[PDB]
Design a protein around this ligand. Structure first.
Ligand SMILES: Nc1ncnc2c1ncn2[C@@H]1O[C@H](CSCC[C@H](N)C(=O)O)[C@@H](O)[C@H]1O
Lengths: 300, 276
């Protein structure tokens, strides 16, 4: 008697729209026609709860960036060089997953662990339905393992952070770059130009205003890293007017215990005895649930 | 052997480098033809014999110090892929700055540009790319540089560019361009850098200028005069320390609107003037 309110509006709007679609019409008959393609599934159901498991129409809480590609970075925090080492594991796990389903994973900045890991590491994953599928992976990830740099066998608790921004069509970017930003160099110093030649170029960009910081480095042209950096600043900016919006799935999200081999999403009280599987690239026995879950939340 | 193994091995016997992992990863990618990410996500992969042998040769070189871009033979500049060789210089990132500053000055109306000591063809190419309405002309003294330049031009498909082999202006005898750009040799015959770095394997033909690394820069600002259109610009790249210096020869030689832009390493890289 409350939600039905909705239908008796759609079923109404659809009827309404299915009409205009039969009059002399050109131009953006696209926008309107497409709406029809939408109101058609939602409508075809209502016109049955009436003509009759009454599949509760979940066809209502729309989404946006879901299909857009995505940037993902892993940061090292708690724990010694132990943590950065898990930054590696985590990052593999993702890329091992992004491949299993043919996504374009491309790094754009790496921070060699002070002893074999990554302080940072940020890939540019690509394929359909990316963001809406790894977003939940944002937050904090904690490991409890027994280091190879330890024989007495006592577990060591270290942790990593994970940001999962969205891929904005750089052909949409707000040209947020007059002089309101400071483009710097990684070179703690140097003569530059002819005097020296390194194997790869590293740029850095700071947003004077909001203060955002982005940087990149690879074997390619500076021109490219920079422009590459401009695209990440943007994704980092749009990552503000999203975190602005106030169970809204570092904040311990999961914990990976190896002596037990379990993984646990604190966020939905789910623990699976399948760490092996999750570390090799099987992030669906996790993303799927936190997804249906984040679903029901919306179904209210 | 395993990609993960090799990478582990090489990085070891490659400590004298400023970027062992990278050097490593690049090499391994080059031979196997698998990107960074792949190598990282799948270190279990074995190397076919060749690869291992091929990877080996390249690795020795790199231990002897041979530049990476020299081993893989390529270099990106302006997001443009350039083949490089010890025939000339390996296009630097700071040189991209020269290009940046030169793109502004350029007249909104289609015109002709000159590139002295084009080398790989870096600057000239990037420009003829941005301004497809302008005819650029790159010349070089070494005959081999002329070819690498032409080779890049071909591979790249840029046709509004033309390579010649003059000694500064010899072949240009009688032409005048809107803007004249040039990164000439500006290293002292005995700067301690020549001592170290990949720069050990780069040619002096392109590294050393005379008069304590200042000989060419000046001889050009001098010459450039008789070849610049009304109020056209002349902009040169120089050493980080030749800041004030170059500025003066620019004023002394008689150049209007002198200036000295700085690159991202926050050094002084390009000095630009004008003429009437
Ligand atoms: N008299 C002369 N005429 C033309 N080129 C000259 C010259 N004397 C030296 N050179 C050229 O000066 C160049 C200096 S290095 C120029 C490199 C170029 N900017 C790059 O990014 O690759 C060399 O290519 C050298 O062959």
């Amino acid at each position: 008697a409350k939600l039905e309110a909705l239908h008796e509006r759609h079923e109404e709007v659809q009827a309404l729209l299915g009409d205009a679609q039969t009059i002399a019409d050109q131009e953006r008959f696209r926008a309107l026609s497409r709406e029809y393609a939408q109101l058609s599934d939602v409508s075809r159901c209502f016109t049955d709860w009436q003509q009759v498991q009454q599949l509760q129409v979940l066809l209502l809480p729309k989404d946006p960036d879901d299909e857009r590609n995505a940037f993902l970075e892993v940061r090292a925090g708690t724990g010694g060089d132990e943590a950065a080492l898990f930054a590696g594991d985590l990052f593999r796990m993702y890329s091992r997953y992004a491949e299993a389903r043919r996504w374009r994973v491309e790094i754009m900045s790496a921070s060699e662990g002070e002893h074999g890991g990554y302080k940072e590491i940020i890939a540019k994953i690509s394929g359909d339905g990316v963001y809406g599928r790894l977003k939940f992976e944002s937050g904090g990830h904690r490991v409890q393992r027994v280091p190879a740099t330890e024989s007495q066998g006592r577990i060591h608790t270290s942790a990593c952070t994970v940001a999962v921004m969205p891929e904005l069509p750089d052909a949409e970017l707000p040209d947020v770059n007059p002089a309101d930003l400071r483009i710097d160099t990684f070179r703690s110093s140097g003569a530059g130009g002819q005097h020296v030649n390194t194997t790869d170029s590293a740029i850095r960009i700071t947003h004077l205003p909001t203060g955002i910081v982005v940087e990149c480095q690879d074997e390619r042209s500076q021109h490219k890293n920079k422009a590459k950096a401009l695209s990440v600043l943007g994704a980092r900016i749009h990552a503000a007017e999203m975190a602005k919006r106030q169970r809204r799935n570092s904040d311990r999200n999961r914990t990976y215990n190896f002596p037990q081999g379990r993984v646990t999403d604190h966020r939905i009280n789910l623990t699976l005895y399948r760490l092996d599987e999750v570390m090799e690239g099987k992030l669906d026995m996790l993303i799927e649930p936190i997804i249906q879950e984040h679903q029901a939340d919306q179904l209210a | 052997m395993e990609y993960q193994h090799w990478l582990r091995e090489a990085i070891s016997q490659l400590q004298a480098s400023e970027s062992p992992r990278r050097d490593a990863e690049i090499l391994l990618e080059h031979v196997t033809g698998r990107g960074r990410t792949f190598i990282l996500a799948f270190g279990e992969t074995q190397l076919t014999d060749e690869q291992c042998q091929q990877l080996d040769a390249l690795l020795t070189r790199r231990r002897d110090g041979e530049p990476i871009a020299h081993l893989t033979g390529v270099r990106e500049f302006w997001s443009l892929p350039l083949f490089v060789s010890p025939a000339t210089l390996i296009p630097r990132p700071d040189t991209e700055c020269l290009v940046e500053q030169a793109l502004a000055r350029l007249p909104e109306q289609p015109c002709r540009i000159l590139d002295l000591g084009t080398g790989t063809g870096a600057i000239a190419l990037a420009l003829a790319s941005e301004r497809p309405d302008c005819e650029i002309i790159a010349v070089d003294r070494m005959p081999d540089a002329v070819s690498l330049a032409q080779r890049n031009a071909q591979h790249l498909a840029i046709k509004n560019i033309h390579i010649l082999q003059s000694d500064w202006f010899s072949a240009l005898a009688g032409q005048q361009f809107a803007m004249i750009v040039s990164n000439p040799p500006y290293i002292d015959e005995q700067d301690p850098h020549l001592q170290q770095g990949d720069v050990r394997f780069e040619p002096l033909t392109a590294l050393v200028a005379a008069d304590s690394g200042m000989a060419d820069i000046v001889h050009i600002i001098e010459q450039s005069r008789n070849a610049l259109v009304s109020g056209g610009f002349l902009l040169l790249e120089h050493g980080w320390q030749q800041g004030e210096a170059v500025r003066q020869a620019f004023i002394l030689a008689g150049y209007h609107d002198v200036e000295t832009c700085r690159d991202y390493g926050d050094n002084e890289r390009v000095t630009l003037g004008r003429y009437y």
